[PDB]
Amino acid sequence: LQVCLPKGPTCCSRKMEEKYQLTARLNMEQLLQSASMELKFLIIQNAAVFQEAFEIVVRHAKNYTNAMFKNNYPSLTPQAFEFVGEFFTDVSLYILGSDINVDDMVNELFDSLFPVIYTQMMNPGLDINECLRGARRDLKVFGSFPKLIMTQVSKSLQVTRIFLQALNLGIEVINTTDHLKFSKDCGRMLTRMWYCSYCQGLMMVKPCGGYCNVVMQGCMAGVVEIDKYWREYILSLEELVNDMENVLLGLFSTIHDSIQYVQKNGGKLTTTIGKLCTLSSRRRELIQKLKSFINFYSALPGYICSHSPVAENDTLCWNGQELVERYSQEPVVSQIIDKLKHINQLLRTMS
Amino acid sequence: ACNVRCGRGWQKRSRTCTNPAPLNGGAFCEGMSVQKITCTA
Ligand SMILES: *[C@@H]1O[C@H](CO)[C@@H](O)[C@H](O)[C@H]1NC(C)=O
Ligand SMILES: *[C@@H]1O[C@H](CO)[C@@H](O)[C@H](O)[C@H]1NC(C)=O
């Protein structure tokens, strides 16, 4: 045998020892999953809700911009629908982590918007399109409106993008916790603590509380080190919540005022161009519920021992090898800590 | 569970992008995140 220390005879072979080891693995995984389930479901719920809510906000803002174009500038439709749809598509693509340039979104928006304004509103009556696109930026026809929108939307979209990435990475690490594979020595110690009493012919004897403590503090020496980074993660997320609905929803008013501004100088512009050519409540409740789990990694061995069958009195208990009257007395964790450090730096910088 | 007691109901299935979650500008998950089916109670 390689696990069950044979003091007398034994009622179990090597294959039964392997079966007990696999059942020990399954029991540890089930206990960790039961410890992590409440927090996992909380973060999954909130991640799903925030993702759907941001998509709803983007769709509604695109709808409102399209509706205000339909009502106030019918001469710019249906071209207006194309560039508005492209703009808000790129908005959503940026929110969901794709490589999109915010300044380029706004600049392509105004580049597409100016030629149809000139041809349908200012000078009524395809090849000259690029000359108009160049004149848009060369003559600064929209004034400071493009840079105003650029900063207004970049500031909110970056915090939203990093909020979603932080929620997803929290889900990732919490899913990793209950799937943390342990050392072989810990496998054998857990097998001894939970099952090796059956090999000695005992039916209902439980392991000592102190033996459970030494075993758990033995194989969770790495997992407990995650607690500092998890606390910093929680506090940095709290720093970040203290934004994007208001901006995307006022975009239509800002664009309308920019169109008025360009129409204001039409006299000189046409001649020159003719010559030349409940959310805040949700994030607050989320942070207040997330602060209740700041001790998650430090209380984990206590959970494993308090939810495993143990003799708390340390009397007539199993010490891993014999029935006593009184008890005598990294790689995946490294990846978790790496990702936590990364997301914590990213969080703190948006502050 | 089907939200409506009698007639056309709904059943949802979520699929998050967390195993692994994109980092340092990783490509996001490809395809749909939610699954919805009509149910008759
Ligand atoms: C926008 O809102 C109006 C409200 O009457 C609706 O009729 C229209 O279908 C909506 N358009 C989009 C694209 O959601
Ligand atoms: C963790 O992600 C894995 C991927 O297969 C999945 O199997 C598991 O159900 C997820 N975790 C939880 C605890 O629900």
Curated annotation (Swiss-Prot), chain A:
Glycosylation sites noted in the Swiss-Prot or TrEMBL record: 63, 175, 313
General function of this protein: Cell surface proteoglycan. Negatively regulates the hedgehog signaling pathway when attached via the GPI-anchor to the cell surface by competing with the hedgehog receptor PTC1 for binding to hedgehog proteins. Binding to the hedgehog protein SHH triggers internalization of the complex by endocytosis and its subsequent lysosomal degradation. Positively regulates the canonical Wnt signaling pathway by binding to the Wnt receptor Frizzled and stimulating the binding of the Frizzled receptor to Wnt ligands. Positively regulates the non-canonical Wnt signaling pathway.
PTM statement from Swiss-Prot or TrEMBL: O-glycosylated; contains heparan sulfate and/or chondroitin sulfate.
Cellular component GO terms held in the UniProt record: Golgi lumen; lysosome; plasma membrane; side of membrane
Residue span relative to the full protein: 61 to 476 of 579
Tissue expression remark: In the developing limb, absent from the apical epidermal ridge at 11 dpc but highly expressed in the underlying mesenchyme. Expression in the mesenchyme at this stage is asymmetric with highest levels in the regions of the distal mesenchyme within the progress zone and within the proximal anterior and posterior limb bud. At later developmental stages including 12.5 and 13.5 dpc, expression is restricted to the interdigital webs and the regions of chondrocytic differentiation of the developing bones.
One GO-annotated biological process of the protein: cell migration involved in gastrulation
Oligomer and partners: Heterodimer; disulfide-linked. Cleavage by a furin-like convertase results in production of alpha and beta chains which form a disulfide-linked heterodimer. Interacts with DPP4. Interacts with FGF2. Interacts with WNT5A. Also interacts with WNT3A and WNT7B. Interacts with hedgehog protein SHH; the heparan sulfate chains are not required for the interaction. Also interacts with hedgehog protein IHH. Interacts with CD81. Interacts with Wnt receptors FZD4, FZD7 and FZD8; the heparan sulfate chains are required for the interaction.
Gene Ontology MF: a single term: peptidyl-dipeptidase inhibitor activity
Recorded phenotype for the gene knockout or disruption: Perinatal death, developmental overgrowth, cystic and dyplastic kidneys, abnormal lung development and ventral wall closure defects. A proportion of mutants also display mandibular hypoplasia and an imperforate vagina. There is an early and persistent abnormality in ureteric bud development in the kidney due to increased cell proliferation. In the developing kidney, cell proliferation is increased threefold in cortical collecting duct cells and apoptosis is increased 16-fold in medullary collecting duct cells.
Family per similarity comment: Belongs to the glypican family.
Name of the protein: Glypican-3
Chief localisation class: membrane
Keyword flag Lipoprotein: yes
Disulfide bridge map: 4-196, 12-199, 131-277, 186-219, 208-317, 212-305
Membrane topology term: Lipid-anchor; GPI-anchor
Localization, UniProt: Cell membrane
Statement: the UniProt record of this protein carries the keyword Methyltransferase: no
From Swiss-Prot, chain B:
Underlying gene: Unc5d
Cystine pairings recorded for this chain: 2-39, 17-29
Annotated family: Belongs to the unc-5 family.
Full-sequence portion shown in this chain: 261 to 301 of 956
Post-translational modification: Proteolytically cleaved by caspases during apoptosis. The cleavage does not take place when the receptor is associated with netrin ligand. Its cleavage by caspases is required to induce apoptosis.
Subunit and partners: Interacts (via extracellular domain) with FLRT2 and FLRT3 (via extracellular domain); the interaction is direct. Has higher affinity for FLRT2. Identified in a complex with FLRT3 and ADGRL3; does not interact with ADGRL3 by itself.
Identification of the protein by name: Netrin receptor UNC5D
Subcellular location as annotated: Cell membrane
Domain of life: Eukaryota
All copies of domain TSP type-1, residue ranges: 1-41
Function: Receptor for the netrin NTN4 that promotes neuronal cell survival. Plays a role in cell-cell adhesion and cell guidance. Receptor for netrin involved in cell migration. Plays a role in axon guidance by mediating axon repulsion of neuronal growth cones in the developing nervous system upon ligand binding. May play a role in apoptosis in response to DNA damage. It also acts as a dependence receptor required for apoptosis induction when not associated with netrin ligand. Mediates cell-cell adhesion via its interaction with FLRT3 on an adjacent cell.
